[PDB]
PDB file of C-alpha atoms and ligand atoms in Angstrom:
ATOM      1  CA  UNK A   1      25.637 -18.210  -6.851  1.00 47.21           C
ATOM      2  CA  UNK A   2      24.552 -17.062  -3.622  1.00 45.22           C
ATOM      3  CA  UNK A   3      26.699 -17.153  -0.491  1.00 43.56           C
ATOM      4  CA  UNK A   4      26.033 -16.480   3.285  1.00 44.47           C
ATOM      5  CA  UNK A   5      28.501 -13.814   4.079  1.00 45.64           C
ATOM      6  CA  UNK A   6      28.490 -10.741   6.378  1.00 47.51           C
ATOM      7  CA  UNK A   7      27.226  -8.673   3.242  1.00 44.97           C
ATOM      8  CA  UNK A   8      23.828 -10.780   3.009  1.00 44.08           C
ATOM      9  CA  UNK A   9      23.645 -11.238   7.069  1.00 43.60           C
ATOM     10  CA  UNK A  10      23.515  -7.207   7.324  1.00 44.54           C
ATOM     11  CA  UNK A  11      21.081  -6.776   4.350  1.00 44.99           C
ATOM     12  CA  UNK A  12      18.881  -9.203   6.527  1.00 47.02           C
ATOM     13  CA  UNK A  13      19.449  -7.648   9.619  1.00 49.29           C
ATOM     14  CA  UNK A  14      17.940  -4.646   7.407  1.00 46.57           C
ATOM     15  CA  UNK A  15      15.341  -6.556   6.184  1.00 46.65           C
ATOM     16  CA  UNK A  16      14.205  -7.735   9.721  1.00 46.92           C
ATOM     17  CA  UNK A  17      14.532  -3.802  11.161  1.00 46.29           C
ATOM     18  CA  UNK A  18      12.097  -2.583   8.177  1.00 44.86           C
ATOM     19  CA  UNK A  19       9.705  -5.552   9.364  1.00 44.91           C
ATOM     20  CA  UNK A  20       9.847  -4.626  13.455  1.00 45.63           C
ATOM     21  CA  UNK A  21       9.210  -1.132  11.884  1.00 47.96           C
ATOM     22  CA  UNK A  22       6.760  -1.776   9.809  1.00 46.41           C
ATOM     23  CA  UNK A  23       4.421  -4.126  12.628  1.00 45.41           C
ATOM     24  CA  UNK A  24       4.769  -1.142  14.850  1.00 47.63           C
ATOM     25  CA  UNK A  25       3.669   1.902  12.047  1.00 44.57           C
ATOM     26  CA  UNK A  26       0.763  -0.383  10.922  1.00 43.74           C
ATOM     27  CA  UNK A  27      -1.725  -1.428  13.049  1.00 45.33           C
ATOM     28  CA  UNK A  28      -3.370  -3.912  10.655  1.00 45.84           C
ATOM     29  CA  UNK A  29      -0.868  -5.765   8.891  1.00 48.31           C
ATOM     30  CA  UNK A  30      -0.925  -8.232   5.569  1.00 47.37           C
ATOM     31  CA  UNK A  31      -1.055 -11.472   7.632  1.00 42.59           C
ATOM     32  CA  UNK A  32      -3.849 -10.004   9.891  1.00 42.25           C
ATOM     33  CA  UNK A  33      -5.779  -9.259   7.099  1.00 40.33           C
ATOM     34  CA  UNK A  34      -5.522 -12.486   5.111  1.00 42.00           C
ATOM     35  CA  UNK A  35      -6.665 -14.258   8.201  1.00 45.71           C
ATOM     36  CA  UNK A  36     -10.099 -11.730   8.562  1.00 45.89           C
ATOM     37  CA  UNK A  37     -10.818 -12.265   4.772  1.00 45.86           C
ATOM     38  CA  UNK A  38     -10.420 -16.134   4.708  1.00 46.72           C
ATOM     39  CA  UNK A  39     -12.175 -16.695   7.904  1.00 48.50           C
ATOM     40  CA  UNK A  40      -8.772 -18.021   9.784  1.00 50.87           C
ATOM     41  CA  UNK A  41      -8.953 -15.876  12.934  1.00 47.11           C
ATOM     42  CA  UNK A  42     -10.677 -16.235  16.553  1.00 52.69           C
ATOM     43  CA  UNK A  43     -10.655 -12.486  16.154  1.00 50.60           C
ATOM     44  CA  UNK A  44     -14.218 -10.610  16.028  1.00 52.46           C
ATOM     45  CA  UNK A  45     -15.921 -11.352  12.538  1.00 51.88           C
ATOM     46  CA  UNK A  46     -16.039  -7.654  11.102  1.00 52.41           C
ATOM     47  CA  UNK A  47     -19.185  -6.696   9.288  1.00 54.17           C
ATOM     48  CA  UNK A  48     -20.422  -6.879   6.007  1.00 56.36           C
ATOM     49  CA  UNK A  49     -21.664  -3.867   3.527  1.00 57.89           C
ATOM     50  CA  UNK A  50     -22.984  -5.528   0.349  1.00 57.81           C
ATOM     51  CA  UNK A  51     -26.284  -3.174  -0.642  1.00 58.99           C
ATOM     52  CA  UNK A  52     -28.000   0.320   0.971  1.00 60.28           C
ATOM     53  CA  UNK A  53     -29.694  -1.062   3.557  1.00 59.65           C
ATOM     54  CA  UNK A  54     -26.507  -3.107   5.105  1.00 56.19           C
ATOM     55  CA  UNK A  55     -24.842  -0.084   4.587  1.00 58.15           C
ATOM     56  CA  UNK A  56     -27.415   2.155   6.691  1.00 62.59           C
ATOM     57  CA  UNK A  57     -26.559  -0.926   9.546  1.00 60.08           C
ATOM     58  CA  UNK A  58     -23.120  -0.643   9.046  1.00 62.06           C
ATOM     59  CA  UNK A  59     -22.767   3.021   9.594  1.00 61.01           C
ATOM     60  CA  UNK A  60     -24.870   2.341  13.445  1.00 63.20           C
ATOM     61  CA  UNK A  61     -22.600  -0.547  14.021  1.00 60.98           C
ATOM     62  CA  UNK A  62     -19.489  -0.098  12.774  1.00 62.67           C
ATOM     63  CA  UNK A  63     -18.841   3.032  14.983  1.00 60.38           C
ATOM     64  CA  UNK A  64     -15.860   4.568  13.180  1.00 57.48           C
ATOM     65  CA  UNK A  65     -22.690  15.114   7.939  1.00 55.46           C
ATOM     66  CA  UNK A  66     -23.469  14.978   3.754  1.00 55.60           C
ATOM     67  CA  UNK A  67     -26.919  13.341   3.754  1.00 55.90           C
ATOM     68  CA  UNK A  68     -25.628  11.516   0.533  1.00 55.34           C
ATOM     69  CA  UNK A  69     -24.204   8.388   1.561  1.00 54.31           C
ATOM     70  CA  UNK A  70     -21.955   8.218  -1.678  1.00 54.22           C
ATOM     71  CA  UNK A  71     -20.222  11.089  -0.041  1.00 54.51           C
ATOM     72  CA  UNK A  72     -19.867  10.267   3.490  1.00 56.61           C
ATOM     73  CA  UNK A  73     -18.219   6.897   2.061  1.00 54.34           C
ATOM     74  CA  UNK A  74     -15.719   9.297   0.755  1.00 55.04           C
ATOM     75  CA  UNK A  75     -14.898  11.123   3.370  1.00 51.76           C
ATOM     76  CA  UNK A  76     -14.132   7.605   5.547  1.00 51.29           C
ATOM     77  CA  UNK A  77     -12.002   6.925   2.834  1.00 52.35           C
ATOM     78  CA  UNK A  78      -9.841  10.646   2.933  1.00 51.51           C
ATOM     79  CA  UNK A  79     -10.009  10.645   6.643  1.00 50.67           C
ATOM     80  CA  UNK A  80      -7.985   7.067   6.893  1.00 44.79           C
ATOM     81  CA  UNK A  81      -5.777   8.317   4.037  1.00 45.23           C
ATOM     82  CA  UNK A  82      -4.609  10.990   6.256  1.00 46.21           C
ATOM     83  CA  UNK A  83      -3.717   8.189   9.299  1.00 48.39           C
ATOM     84  CA  UNK A  84      -2.039   6.281   6.117  1.00 47.05           C
ATOM     85  CA  UNK A  85      -0.151   9.465   5.938  1.00 52.83           C
ATOM     86  CA  UNK A  86       0.762   9.544   9.702  1.00 50.90           C
ATOM     87  CA  UNK A  87       1.882   6.027   9.923  1.00 50.02           C
ATOM     88  CA  UNK A  88       3.281   5.748   6.107  1.00 47.52           C
ATOM     89  CA  UNK A  89       5.841   9.145   7.672  1.00 43.61           C
ATOM     90  CA  UNK A  90       6.168   7.555  11.170  1.00 43.41           C
ATOM     91  CA  UNK A  91       8.024   4.513   9.081  1.00 42.78           C
ATOM     92  CA  UNK A  92       9.648   6.337   6.823  1.00 44.67           C
ATOM     93  CA  UNK A  93      11.657   7.851  10.252  1.00 41.72           C
ATOM     94  CA  UNK A  94      12.858   4.029  11.110  1.00 40.43           C
ATOM     95  CA  UNK A  95      14.434   3.600   7.051  1.00 43.04           C
ATOM     96  CA  UNK A  96      18.384   3.878   8.092  1.00 39.44           C
ATOM     97  CA  UNK A  97      19.625   7.319   6.801  1.00 38.64           C
ATOM     98  CA  UNK A  98      16.199   9.125   5.955  1.00 39.75           C
ATOM     99  CA  UNK A  99      15.958  11.188   9.122  1.00 35.81           C
ATOM    100  CA  UNK A 100      19.698  12.086   8.517  1.00 39.11           C
ATOM    101  CA  UNK A 101      18.319  13.581   4.559  1.00 38.42           C
ATOM    102  CA  UNK A 102      17.406  17.830   4.124  1.00 37.16           C
ATOM    103  CA  UNK A 103      14.527  18.409   5.866  1.00 38.70           C
ATOM    104  CA  UNK A 104      12.713  19.488   2.615  1.00 35.84           C
ATOM    105  CA  UNK A 105      14.114  16.220   1.203  1.00 34.22           C
ATOM    106  CA  UNK A 106      12.444  13.905   3.896  1.00 36.15           C
ATOM    107  CA  UNK A 107       9.110  16.153   2.952  1.00 35.24           C
ATOM    108  CA  UNK A 108       8.941  15.703  -1.149  1.00 38.23           C
ATOM    109  CA  UNK A 109       9.806  11.610  -0.841  1.00 37.02           C
ATOM    110  CA  UNK A 110       6.835  11.344   1.389  1.00 38.62           C
ATOM    111  CA  UNK A 111       4.031  14.136  -0.280  1.00 38.82           C
ATOM    112  CA  UNK A 112       5.489  11.696  -3.899  1.00 38.19           C
ATOM    113  CA  UNK A 113       5.384   8.836  -2.471  1.00 41.56           C
ATOM    114  CA  UNK A 114       2.225   8.442   0.067  1.00 42.55           C
ATOM    115  CA  UNK A 115      -0.502   7.481  -2.564  1.00 43.48           C
ATOM    116  CA  UNK A 116       1.829   5.270  -4.368  1.00 45.40           C
ATOM    117  CA  UNK A 117       2.342   3.434  -0.939  1.00 44.05           C
ATOM    118  CA  UNK A 118      -1.902   3.660   0.133  1.00 40.85           C
ATOM    119  CA  UNK A 119      -2.918   1.414  -3.230  1.00 42.29           C
ATOM    120  CA  UNK A 120       0.053  -1.296  -2.149  1.00 39.73           C
ATOM    121  CA  UNK A 121      -1.167  -1.210   2.135  1.00 39.54           C
ATOM    122  CA  UNK A 122      -5.270  -1.261   0.493  1.00 36.15           C
ATOM    123  CA  UNK A 123      -4.313  -4.436  -2.138  1.00 33.60           C
ATOM    124  CA  UNK A 124      -2.988  -6.587   1.606  1.00 31.01           C
ATOM    125  CA  UNK A 125      -7.104  -5.439   2.395  1.00 31.02           C
ATOM    126  CA  UNK A 126      -8.905  -6.296  -0.461  1.00 29.01           C
ATOM    127  CA  UNK A 127      -9.604  -9.846  -1.584  1.00 24.83           C
ATOM    128  CA  UNK A 128     -12.014 -10.306  -5.469  1.00 20.88           C
ATOM    129  CA  UNK A 129     -15.283  -9.126  -2.909  1.00 22.04           C
ATOM    130  CA  UNK A 130     -14.067  -6.513  -1.940  1.00 20.07           C
ATOM    131  CA  UNK A 131     -11.862  -4.065   1.213  1.00 18.16           C
ATOM    132  CA  UNK A 132     -11.701  -4.507   5.021  1.00 20.16           C
ATOM    133  CA  UNK A 133     -12.708  -1.159   6.165  1.00 20.98           C
ATOM    134  CA  UNK A 134     -12.451   1.076  10.106  1.00 19.80           C
ATOM    135  CA  UNK A 135      -9.607  -1.258  10.939  1.00 18.22           C
ATOM    136  CA  UNK A 136     -10.958  -3.981   9.462  1.00 19.87           C
ATOM    137  CA  UNK A 137     -14.002  -4.057  11.746  1.00 19.49           C
ATOM    138  CA  UNK A 138     -15.820  -3.274   8.571  1.00 18.06           C
ATOM    139  CA  UNK A 139     -16.131  -5.101   4.574  1.00 19.30           C
ATOM    140  CA  UNK A 140     -17.524  -3.327   1.999  1.00 19.87           C
ATOM    141  CA  UNK A 141     -17.982  -5.191  -1.886  1.00 23.30           C
ATOM    142  CA  UNK A 142     -16.500  -4.026  -4.542  1.00 24.43           C
ATOM    143  CA  UNK A 143     -19.907  -4.382  -6.709  1.00 21.66           C
ATOM    144  CA  UNK A 144     -21.310  -1.726  -3.642  1.00 22.08           C
ATOM    145  CA  UNK A 145     -19.113   0.696  -4.173  1.00 20.47           C
ATOM    146  CA  UNK A 146     -19.550   0.803  -8.087  1.00 20.71           C
ATOM    147  CA  UNK A 147     -22.562   1.283  -6.749  1.00 20.87           C
ATOM    148  CA  UNK A 148     -22.190   4.914  -6.072  1.00 16.71           C
ATOM    149  CA  UNK A 149     -23.402   7.754  -8.366  1.00 16.60           C
ATOM    150  CA  UNK A 150     -20.942   9.376 -10.429  1.00 18.31           C
ATOM    151  CA  UNK A 151     -18.468  10.182  -9.479  1.00 18.39           C
ATOM    152  CA  UNK A 152     -17.768   8.260  -6.844  1.00 20.35           C
ATOM    153  CA  UNK A 153     -18.806   4.733  -8.346  1.00 21.34           C
ATOM    154  CA  UNK A 154     -15.377   4.609 -10.527  1.00 21.05           C
ATOM    155  CA  UNK A 155     -13.489   6.333  -7.116  1.00 20.29           C
ATOM    156  CA  UNK A 156     -11.926   2.181  -6.119  1.00 19.59           C
ATOM    157  CA  UNK A 157     -12.145   0.552  -9.295  1.00 19.23           C
ATOM    158  CA  UNK A 158      -8.509   1.362 -10.201  1.00 15.34           C
ATOM    159  CA  UNK A 159      -7.399   0.347  -6.355  1.00 20.06           C
ATOM    160  CA  UNK A 160      -9.762  -3.135  -7.071  1.00 18.19           C
ATOM    161  CA  UNK A 161      -7.635  -3.788 -10.214  1.00 17.11           C
ATOM    162  CA  UNK A 162      -4.048  -3.058  -8.964  1.00 17.12           C
ATOM    163  CA  UNK A 163      -4.999  -5.149  -6.194  1.00 16.77           C
ATOM    164  CA  UNK A 164      -6.165  -8.651  -8.055  1.00 17.16           C
ATOM    165  CA  UNK A 165      -2.941  -8.352  -9.659  1.00 15.61           C
ATOM    166  CA  UNK A 166      -0.899  -7.632  -6.974  1.00 14.10           C
ATOM    167  CA  UNK A 167      -1.910  -9.703  -4.484  1.00 13.77           C
ATOM    168  CA  UNK A 168      -2.094 -12.778  -7.273  1.00 13.07           C
ATOM    169  CA  UNK A 169       2.341 -12.471  -6.879  1.00 10.30           C
ATOM    170  CA  UNK A 170       1.413 -13.630  -2.758  1.00  7.74           C
ATOM    171  CA  UNK A 171       3.872 -10.768  -1.234  1.00  7.68           C
ATOM    172  CA  UNK A 172       3.829 -11.085   2.473  1.00  5.97           C
ATOM    173  CA  UNK A 173       4.910  -8.238   5.335  1.00  5.58           C
ATOM    174  CA  UNK A 174       9.047  -9.000   4.594  1.00  5.20           C
ATOM    175  CA  UNK A 175       8.301  -8.364   1.099  1.00  4.18           C
ATOM    176  CA  UNK A 176       6.460  -5.363   1.529  1.00  5.10           C
ATOM    177  CA  UNK A 177       8.309  -3.894   4.045  1.00  2.34           C
ATOM    178  CA  UNK A 178      11.207  -3.578   1.769  1.00  2.00           C
ATOM    179  CA  UNK A 179       8.847  -2.787  -1.248  1.00  2.38           C
ATOM    180  CA  UNK A 180       7.555  -0.186   0.494  1.00  3.39           C
ATOM    181  CA  UNK A 181      10.729   1.787   1.751  1.00  5.14           C
ATOM    182  CA  UNK A 182      12.182   1.389  -1.918  1.00  4.18           C
ATOM    183  CA  UNK A 183       9.390   3.346  -3.313  1.00  4.40           C
ATOM    184  CA  UNK A 184       9.717   6.290  -0.567  1.00  7.40           C
ATOM    185  CA  UNK A 185      13.676   6.829  -1.469  1.00  9.77           C
ATOM    186  CA  UNK A 186      12.693   7.113  -5.213  1.00 10.74           C
ATOM    187  CA  UNK A 187      15.507   9.975  -6.347  1.00 11.47           C
ATOM    188  CA  UNK A 188      13.394  10.851  -9.205  1.00 10.65           C
ATOM    189  CA  UNK A 189      10.751  12.689  -6.684  1.00 13.76           C
ATOM    190  CA  UNK A 190      10.449  16.222  -8.645  1.00 12.60           C
ATOM    191  CA  UNK A 191      12.213  19.197  -6.815  1.00 12.12           C
ATOM    192  CA  UNK A 192      14.311  16.858  -4.647  1.00 12.06           C
ATOM    193  CA  UNK A 193      17.618  19.054  -3.826  1.00 12.98           C
ATOM    194  CA  UNK A 194      20.553  16.312  -3.288  1.00 12.09           C
ATOM    195  CA  UNK A 195      19.606  13.169  -5.031  1.00  9.04           C
ATOM    196  CA  UNK A 196      22.415  11.185  -4.893  1.00 10.13           C
ATOM    197  CA  UNK A 197      21.890  10.362  -0.506  1.00  8.91           C
ATOM    198  CA  UNK A 198      18.050   9.210  -1.430  1.00  9.48           C
ATOM    199  CA  UNK A 199      19.895   6.627  -4.888  1.00  9.49           C
ATOM    200  CA  UNK A 200      22.811   5.283  -1.884  1.00  7.57           C
ATOM    201  CA  UNK A 201      20.294   4.352   0.484  1.00  6.74           C
ATOM    202  CA  UNK A 202      17.725   3.096  -2.360  1.00  7.33           C
ATOM    203  CA  UNK A 203      20.040   0.891  -4.008  1.00  6.84           C
ATOM    204  CA  UNK A 204      20.783  -0.834  -0.067  1.00  8.06           C
ATOM    205  CA  UNK A 205      17.099  -1.091  -0.009  1.00  6.26           C
ATOM    206  CA  UNK A 206      17.262  -2.418  -3.465  1.00  7.19           C
ATOM    207  CA  UNK A 207      19.696  -4.871  -2.906  1.00  6.84           C
ATOM    208  CA  UNK A 208      18.201  -5.846   0.764  1.00  7.86           C
ATOM    209  CA  UNK A 209      14.645  -6.649  -1.564  1.00 10.74           C
ATOM    210  CA  UNK A 210      16.199  -8.362  -3.960  1.00 10.26           C
ATOM    211  CA  UNK A 211      17.751 -10.813  -1.301  1.00 13.11           C
ATOM    212  CA  UNK A 212      14.360 -11.248   0.437  1.00 13.60           C
ATOM    213  CA  UNK A 213      12.706 -12.091  -2.306  1.00 13.89           C
ATOM    214  CA  UNK A 214      15.287 -14.767  -3.527  1.00 10.00           C
ATOM    215  CA  UNK A 215      15.088 -16.461  -0.066  1.00  7.11           C
ATOM    216  CA  UNK A 216      11.365 -15.536   0.069  1.00  7.85           C
ATOM    217  CA  UNK A 217       9.755 -16.781  -3.249  1.00  7.03           C
ATOM    218  CA  UNK A 218      11.338 -20.221  -5.030  1.00  6.09           C
ATOM    219  CA  UNK A 219       8.688 -19.862  -7.310  1.00  7.89           C
ATOM    220  CA  UNK A 220       9.532 -16.889  -9.504  1.00  8.61           C
ATOM    221  CA  UNK A 221      13.259 -16.422  -9.745  1.00 11.73           C
ATOM    222  CA  UNK A 222      12.074 -12.664 -11.483  1.00 11.02           C
ATOM    223  CA  UNK A 223      10.140 -11.072  -8.663  1.00 10.03           C
ATOM    224  CA  UNK A 224      12.240  -8.986  -8.049  1.00 12.54           C
ATOM    225  CA  UNK A 225      11.965  -7.138 -11.749  1.00  9.12           C
ATOM    226  CA  UNK A 226       8.248  -7.220 -11.580  1.00  5.71           C
ATOM    227  CA  UNK A 227       8.036  -5.326  -8.235  1.00  3.87           C
ATOM    228  CA  UNK A 228       9.903  -3.263  -9.910  1.00  6.25           C
ATOM    229  CA  UNK A 229       7.113  -2.595 -12.873  1.00  5.47           C
ATOM    230  CA  UNK A 230       4.871  -2.507 -10.244  1.00  4.68           C
ATOM    231  CA  UNK A 231       6.244   0.896  -8.669  1.00  4.97           C
ATOM    232  CA  UNK A 232       6.367   1.933 -12.642  1.00  5.35           C
ATOM    233  CA  UNK A 233       2.539   1.021 -12.713  1.00  4.57           C
ATOM    234  CA  UNK A 234       1.343   2.438  -9.353  1.00  5.15           C
ATOM    235  CA  UNK A 235       3.341   6.182 -10.839  1.00  8.30           C
ATOM    236  CA  UNK A 236       0.596   6.373 -14.026  1.00  9.72           C
ATOM    237  CA  UNK A 237      -2.322   4.990 -11.287  1.00  8.22           C
ATOM    238  CA  UNK A 238      -1.674   7.628  -8.409  1.00  6.07           C
ATOM    239  CA  UNK A 239      -2.025  10.449 -12.068  1.00  4.00           C
ATOM    240  CA  UNK A 240      -5.535   8.713 -12.999  1.00  5.93           C
ATOM    241  CA  UNK A 241      -5.865   9.293  -8.944  1.00  8.46           C
ATOM    242  CA  UNK A 242      -5.028  12.571  -8.354  1.00 10.53           C
ATOM    243  CA  UNK A 243      -6.675  13.502 -11.564  1.00 12.22           C
ATOM    244  CA  UNK A 244     -10.353  12.860 -10.062  1.00 13.79           C
ATOM    245  CA  UNK A 245      -9.230  13.639  -6.558  1.00 10.58           C
ATOM    246  CA  UNK A 246      -9.732  16.865  -8.802  1.00 10.89           C
ATOM    247  CA  UNK A 247     -12.815  16.620 -11.016  1.00 11.63           C
ATOM    248  CA  UNK A 248     -14.726  15.895  -7.169  1.00  7.80           C
ATOM    249  CA  UNK A 249     -12.835  18.666  -5.304  1.00  6.38           C
ATOM    250  CA  UNK A 250     -14.578  21.690  -8.474  1.00  7.69           C
ATOM    251  CA  UNK A 251     -17.763  19.071  -8.448  1.00 10.09           C
ATOM    252  CA  UNK A 252     -18.600  18.249  -4.558  1.00 12.20           C
ATOM    253  CA  UNK A 253     -18.907  20.726  -1.752  1.00 13.51           C
ATOM    254  CA  UNK A 254     -10.251  16.161   8.644  1.00 15.02           C
ATOM    255  CA  UNK A 255      -9.843  17.702  12.406  1.00 14.99           C
ATOM    256  CA  UNK A 256      -5.501  17.582  12.002  1.00 14.05           C
ATOM    257  CA  UNK A 257      -5.978  20.032   8.956  1.00 15.95           C
ATOM    258  CA  UNK A 258      -8.435  22.352  11.231  1.00 13.29           C
ATOM    259  CA  UNK A 259      -5.395  22.498  13.807  1.00 13.39           C
TER     260      UNK A 259
ATOM    261  CA  UNK B   1      -2.541  20.444   2.596  1.00 16.72           C
ATOM    262  CA  UNK B   2      -0.633  16.868   2.394  1.00 19.53           C
ATOM    263  CA  UNK B   3       3.177  18.969   3.453  1.00 20.87           C
ATOM    264  CA  UNK B   4       1.054  20.475   6.760  1.00 21.94           C
ATOM    265  CA  UNK B   5       0.534  16.890   7.694  1.00 18.24           C
ATOM    266  CA  UNK B   6       3.857  15.378   6.878  1.00 16.89           C
ATOM    267  CA  UNK B   7       6.101  18.268   8.630  1.00 20.59           C
ATOM    268  CA  UNK B   8       4.072  17.822  11.441  1.00 19.34           C
ATOM    269  CA  UNK B   9       4.229  14.352  11.255  1.00 19.28           C
ATOM    270  CA  UNK B  10       8.079  14.370  10.665  1.00 20.75           C
ATOM    271  CA  UNK B  11       8.861  16.185  13.956  1.00 20.23           C
TER     272      UNK B  11
HETATM  273  O1  Q1R C 301     -14.723   3.999   6.272  1.00 21.76           O
HETATM  274  C1  Q1R C 301     -14.951   4.475   5.594  1.00 21.76           C
HETATM  275  N1  Q1R C 301     -15.949   5.266   4.713  1.00 21.76           N
HETATM  276  C2  Q1R C 301     -16.793   5.900   5.818  1.00 21.76           C
HETATM  277  C3  Q1R C 301     -18.069   5.237   6.230  1.00 21.76           C
HETATM  278  C4  Q1R C 301     -18.364   3.601   5.607  1.00 21.76           C
HETATM  279  C5  Q1R C 301     -19.523   3.723   5.392  1.00 21.76           C
HETATM  280  C6  Q1R C 301     -20.442   4.158   5.868  1.00 21.76           C
HETATM  281  C7  Q1R C 301     -20.657   5.158   5.853  1.00 21.76           C
HETATM  282  C8  Q1R C 301     -19.348   5.936   6.066  1.00 21.76           C
HETATM  283  C9  Q1R C 301     -14.188   3.894   4.522  1.00 21.76           C
HETATM  284  C10 Q1R C 301     -14.559   4.043   3.307  1.00 21.76           C
HETATM  285  C11 Q1R C 301     -13.370   3.369   2.000  1.00 21.76           C
HETATM  286 CL1  Q1R C 301     -14.307   3.125   0.789  1.00 21.76          CL
HETATM  287  C12 Q1R C 301     -12.085   3.082   2.460  1.00 21.76           C
HETATM  288  C13 Q1R C 301     -11.762   3.580   3.075  1.00 21.76           C
HETATM  289  C14 Q1R C 301     -10.266   2.594   3.999  1.00 21.76           C
HETATM  290  O2  Q1R C 301      -9.722   2.110   4.631  1.00 21.76           O
HETATM  291  N2  Q1R C 301      -9.520   3.065   3.528  1.00 21.76           N
HETATM  292  C15 Q1R C 301      -8.200   3.058   3.357  1.00 21.76           C
HETATM  293  C16 Q1R C 301      -7.255   4.501   2.853  1.00 21.76           C
HETATM  294  C17 Q1R C 301      -5.698   4.106   2.996  1.00 21.76           C
HETATM  295  C18 Q1R C 301      -5.508   3.236   3.198  1.00 21.76           C
HETATM  296  C19 Q1R C 301      -6.454   2.018   4.140  1.00 21.76           C
HETATM  297  C20 Q1R C 301      -7.559   2.599   4.064  1.00 21.76           C
HETATM  298  C21 Q1R C 301     -12.766   3.613   4.545  1.00 21.76           C
END
């Protein structure tokens, strides 16, 4: 049975520390996202891109140079992912023990984690109709993205597919902060030098995640197991994503890379 | 590319 002891208290303070750091590193939280998507906010109502005409108006009145709509959209998506890498790295630094690891191992974890965490944070921004863009100034429908010419038409479909089932689990920001920390501290990334210290931090994050989910989700006694199955799903999902990022690169031709 | 951004962000 479960007891409120010094050990459970320390896992709750670790959970709270990650939440606080999460809120700091990620400007747009799932709570705020869900308020915008459900019209349960006083904040400015986002501009809806549902067709080519509403895209053209949207570019002029979103305020975020290829002559193809499809390429301009994909470029915005890739620029936002660079920004997401920076936010996720900043978050990684807040995880107790992470800045103490071999810098090269710090890089490897982030290098192989960021795509998996980007799919996760995209679900927070999605409902059945589409995805919030431009830090919640815009909303782009799933069916409009799907109408873009090959190979851009299929770019966002697997993120939507993941998000529909991931969102059904009804995680909140407190669950997600720990979930994302478990992903980053994955001891099985290729090329890691010193595995055990990563598994040691991960063990602690897994205990914290399990407790968070028991306290926060009385409706699913095996939510912990289901979340580990999603980390497993995300691995092959990122495989397919990285695959398509190539097919684009060699078939179709950010200021911090230029610097 | 990806490593470049992570390393500079990690500073
Ligand atoms: O702003 C975007 N594209 C530029 C644009 C929009 C509309 C008309 C012309 C040009 C854009 C488009 C898509 Cl499909 C997704 C995202 C996005 O926010 N991705 C994202 C990645 C990582 C973490 C969180 C979100 C951004």
